[PDB]
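Handout, section 4.2: multi-component inputs.
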Amino acid sequence: GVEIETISPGDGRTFPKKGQTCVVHYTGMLQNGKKFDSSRDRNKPFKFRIGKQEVIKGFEEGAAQMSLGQRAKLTCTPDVAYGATGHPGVIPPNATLIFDVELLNLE
Amino acid sequence: ACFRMTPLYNLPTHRACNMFLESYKAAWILTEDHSFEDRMIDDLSKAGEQEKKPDPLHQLVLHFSRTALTEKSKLDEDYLYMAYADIMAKSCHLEEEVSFEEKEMEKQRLLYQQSRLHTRGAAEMVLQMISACKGETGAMVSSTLKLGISILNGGNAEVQQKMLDYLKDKKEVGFFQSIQALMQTCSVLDLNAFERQNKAEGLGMVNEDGTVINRQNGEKVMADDEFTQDLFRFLQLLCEGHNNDFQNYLRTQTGNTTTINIIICTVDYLLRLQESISDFYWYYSGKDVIEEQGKRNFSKAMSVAKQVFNSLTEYIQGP
Amino acid sequence: MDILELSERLDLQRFHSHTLRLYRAVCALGNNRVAHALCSHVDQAQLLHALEDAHLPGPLRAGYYDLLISIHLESACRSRRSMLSEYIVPLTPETRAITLFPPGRRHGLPGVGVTTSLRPPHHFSPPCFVAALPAEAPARLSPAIPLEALRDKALRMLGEAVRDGGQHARDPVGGSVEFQFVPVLKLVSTLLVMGIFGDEDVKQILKMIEPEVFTEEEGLLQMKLPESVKLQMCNLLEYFCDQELQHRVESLAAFAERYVDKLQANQRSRYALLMRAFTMSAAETARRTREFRSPPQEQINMLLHFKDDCPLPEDIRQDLQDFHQDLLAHCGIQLEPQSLQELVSHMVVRWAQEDYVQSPELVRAMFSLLHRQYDGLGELLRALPRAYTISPSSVEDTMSLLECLGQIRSLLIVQMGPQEENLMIQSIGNIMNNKVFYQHPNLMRALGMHETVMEVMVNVLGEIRFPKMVTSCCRFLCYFCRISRQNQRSMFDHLSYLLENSGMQGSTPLDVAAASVIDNNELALALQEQDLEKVVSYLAGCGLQSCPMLLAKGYPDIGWNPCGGERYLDFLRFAVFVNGESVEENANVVVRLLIRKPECFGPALRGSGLLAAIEEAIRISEDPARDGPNRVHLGHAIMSFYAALIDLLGRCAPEMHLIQAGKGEALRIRAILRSLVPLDDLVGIISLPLQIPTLVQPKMSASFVPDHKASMVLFLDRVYGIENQDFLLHVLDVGFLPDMRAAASLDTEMALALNRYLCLAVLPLITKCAP
Amino acid sequence: LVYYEGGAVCTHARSLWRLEPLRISWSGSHLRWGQPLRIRHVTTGRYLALVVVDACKAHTKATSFCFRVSKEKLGMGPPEIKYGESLCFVQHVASGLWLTYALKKKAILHQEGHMDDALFLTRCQQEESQAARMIHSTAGLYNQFIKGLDSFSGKPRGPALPIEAVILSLQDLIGYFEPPSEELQHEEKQSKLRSLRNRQSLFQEEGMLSLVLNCIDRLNVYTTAAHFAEYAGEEAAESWKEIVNLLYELLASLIRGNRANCALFSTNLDWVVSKLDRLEASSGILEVLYCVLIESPEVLNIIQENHIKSIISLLDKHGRNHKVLDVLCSLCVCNGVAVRSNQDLITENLLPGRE
Amino acid sequence: MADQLTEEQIAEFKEAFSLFDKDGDGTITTKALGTVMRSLGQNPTEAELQDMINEVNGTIDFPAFLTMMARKMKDTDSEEEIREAFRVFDKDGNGYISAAALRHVMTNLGEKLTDEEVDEMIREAGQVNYEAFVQMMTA
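Output:
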């Protein structure tokens, strides 16, 4: 349940490989549209290493499916992230998530 | 082990600095004297003059009066009030073969500093907190009585007239009961902890680079001494000018619901003192000579006895 | 809708104001797992945007400022403010160059300079919401926010406000002058206590208060202020006087390491001159009482006497007095407004002349500030017990200790649940193997660590909610009480409280009280009598009722307590017997009180035979039906209880040299103990043979132990005595030559339970009667 | 039965007795020795006879007592009987039987007597004794009102209960218990508080809390304000809406401030929260819950997730009431000590819907 | 009283204990206690090993380890302290301290002993030896 719909195309050839870091200037919503998160408000390019399962499963699977500089809209299903219980305090149980990411640099 | 004591240069330097601070504060900083207690109270009194509002000092004892009237079971030990209880107490101890005139100015300057407190309502603050004690013989009722003496020292008159009316419009039973409560919790000469101290006195220096702090143990027998002397010294000063109404108040609170008759309660401490000094005689009636610690105990019990006979006779100096 | 419309909506202003109270109350007191959860709902930029949008209404501005500190700058705030009252300085050379006055008698600027006292870092963690969920989690830190960006914004909003306030504008920011400054001071005050400001920043802050004084516009103190804005001025000014005091202590610590390094070489040169001096002998030992005959604590007390018989030269005895005059002049004593204490004493008194202040909080914060300046000497004194000095090689473990200290004080204020219990145990288990807790027992006492672990045992006892916690706390205190003797002296003082909760397996609060009085004649002599009668009243209960947990376990019923009552006599046998000797004053009052309630003795002798009582125990211990059916056998506890009632009274027997004197009181007691017990009851007990292990091993906790015999031999050898040769040889062949060759047989488990029994109980008593 | 007690029931409402001599006129003359009189309990309104008995069956032959000093074989008044000094006993004037004991030392008229019937009297206080007699005036109305309601408690309608008598009687009690103003002077505000702390402890001890709890639970069962009030008729039906609201105001006025009476709801906490959506006096019960959750902190940690889910369900059905956010702000901390069990039950319920 | 050890031993002990610490908990096995003392050069046999664990489950914790380390070094210093205590009396250091050179070294040490007790020390004991003096002091 990892649906990537493109928003702006990138290089088309540069892809992140394993054992590597990324820098994503992401933001997320819910299906109702309520904006539970961003990154630009914190003014920090969010970084993470692929493969090591730091992020949820719907995130890094969307991450290697992008090119460098591409802008993509993701749709992570309930079963791929925060399935039964959800995050405490933030994300309700059985919630489908909607993301807007952008691979800044470094593969 | 007294012979194997290591020298200072063998010690690590950080521990050497540690014992220095315990020494340097003890022999230099603690010994230092200064007289800031008078040059504070003037500007808290003079600043009411400016270009019916209360004075800076007059605001302060109003605030201490307000915290003594809130309904609480116990009286919480504020360090700040004890930090101000002695400072106002030392404003009168500067005045507390001579000519005739020069002692009157030494007298009247004490009535100046006594006026500098008790026209700002200092007389009823020290009367409320004894009712707010309700018998808990803690550290605050030590520090509140030294202020109560330095206002009524020398036998001032109108502070008693500022005190009788306060106990007559309020009908405050609870003062006199707290007076009666502090009376019974006055230690006397014992014959059990005395030899406990003496068996403790057989040790002079403790092993492993430690010192027996003789002030830590102190006097386990009659450590209540200077406090229980101070209460009767306060109690003597309520009828110093032979104010005959207190002679009929201290045995009968006739406006109140329940009399206490502290005069009778003063007798009953004296009897408890009387057997306690007499049994100290019977322990020493077999011994021939008296050592050093035996007299220091016996010097204590008569010094509080002279206080209470003097406090007795001011109930009856007036006819 | 636009949020500025709440300024006239006047109803959804209120309901969105009270929502901000629910936001501050949920993430209150360091709840940092939920503090990330709020960081989603109110973002980072829109909180920083709301700090300066001046058209916000009144009670909504004081919400969004106080929301900010309650999700970011509170969990770090309490932990550093806790470590401010204590001063821990290392010996770096940066410390070594610290003076009272700056070099250039001109009084230096407060809070400006270099301090060296240890403080833990803050450990923020950045928020995220796409990280995967694990799982018990260890902890959550406080969520982060960029501080170096924040200090420039906070200084700017203060810097305009002192300037715009001089303009006396009719439309102030946020609807008053009260809301213009109260939500900007209490952020600046809590960024000033966290120490994250540069010194050039607080140089600007000193200009923004009263620039006429602190210079190396109109001042803020001259501005007419309403009452609540004066309050944050006191909480701002209270930080500054402490930075004068912490600099003063760190000056005096710098002075001492320069001084005692100069003092050790002076002594060791003087001692070597004493080592080569043979010109005197009777006066030589008067010079030798100090060198190796006195303790080193008494050396420094004797060395430092030269104010108004000192072995120190006049060169290094004067610079101390030169230093001492540098410190009183640094304080308020002139020792015959350009000063901070000159400024405050003017400003605080003038505030009383302004109006009659009604808010009782401000009148306390005023006068506590004012007394702090005038008795500036005593303000230095009361901090000095919290002054300690460590080695620079120990700092890398000391700050690792202090962070593990801070988690406990954070758990002081939260009601204990099943998670933070595992935080407390893992904290405490990381303290007791940190190696500095031992080598500086004054410092652990100085930080109030021994006080802190007591109150978390107070709150749990108030049925026991969390027993696995309360063992490891009282285990920590028992391991604390034997580090130094004066630490045991401190723990002794909470005895009556510790005694009130004597009421299970594992350790107990009472074994804390036992290890507070052991091995020390000072405490045992100073032990109260009212603290003794409480111990026997809990001993008054156990002889009448059973253990309700044991009959809940399905055991047979026994009307008294062979297991519970033995948890007091092991305490009281430390109450009268110390250093292998009996006390007098406690022994003469425990037995006078033990006979007021004769139910306190075991009821078989209150009566059946004493050997018959143990004979009644062997059947119910050997038979499993009459035994307790798993760790508690009733038959093993009855012989163990009477092993406790015997050797207590043996250790209250008056000593022999007082029997040689005619002390009639001391021989009155020796009558009573001999009157209670028949001697021949002991002889059947001292001679009963045991199940020796050979080819099979019997059970220790269900059968006779040699420690049952070890209690009885101490009783007869201390109150009855061995007089003649026949009665010596009477019990000799019957008891011990059965056991000796039983011990000589195995030359194994109970062999070592009996080897130490023989070498500590009977072979002394043989050598007492060898002639 | 008559008893004795220590000091706890010495101060309270039970240990208050008034003397009633036989002669009508000049009854407030000075009492003298050898004088016949009756004995009244003030709260029950019963007459002492060695049992207490009702006034309708109190006879001058059955109950007539007297004050004698010791039994030798024997307008206004002269001042005969001092206070605290007389130390005199009681016995029947027809029987001569000395009331004495046997912690509840049961008092009995005994012809042997003892050496312990020399008992000293103490006069009561004016504000307290005024608070005494109104208990009897209210409870006599209230239990009459309860069993008046209990008559048709099962029988539908195809005596008259005191509707107008009870409406005015509550409203005087609200103003009796009204907390003093904040604009008052501080030394007098504190003095008037400790008077109020007595005379709500003086009610909740001697009944008058659960007695108020009863007349709620006989009335709350009629949720239709008219149709289930038609068991009475149309007369009491018009005043049913009022009598509930005034009742919760009384109870909220009782446990305001007082910590000791706030612990009296630690057993029936669930009785309170179960009536939050009752649609009549919804502010009334919510007022009672707010004052109890700020005085006694032990009622915080006895709250489970079934209770909090009703309160959020109250907010979702009663608008954006700003009082509901107060009681949740009291539910987080108590006395500066937070409850980590409660600080997450709110959060993962209220916040995550964002709606 | 655990203060009778100096700091650097506890520094050496914790260095030894953390070196054989099982998981960083501060637990060690019963065998490793023997190895770690032989890692510190101390070689006691299983007799001195056996009585120490039963004095305090197979799990040795660092305070439980350290209290045994205090007692093993308390008894050894308690007997070697008293011969070096006699060293300061005699000018040579053998045991021959003249009784004339004692009644000013004993009233000048700091336990505040007056002339009567240092008399009472002497006539209830020419030059006296050391072994009678360690007998007359320990008593």
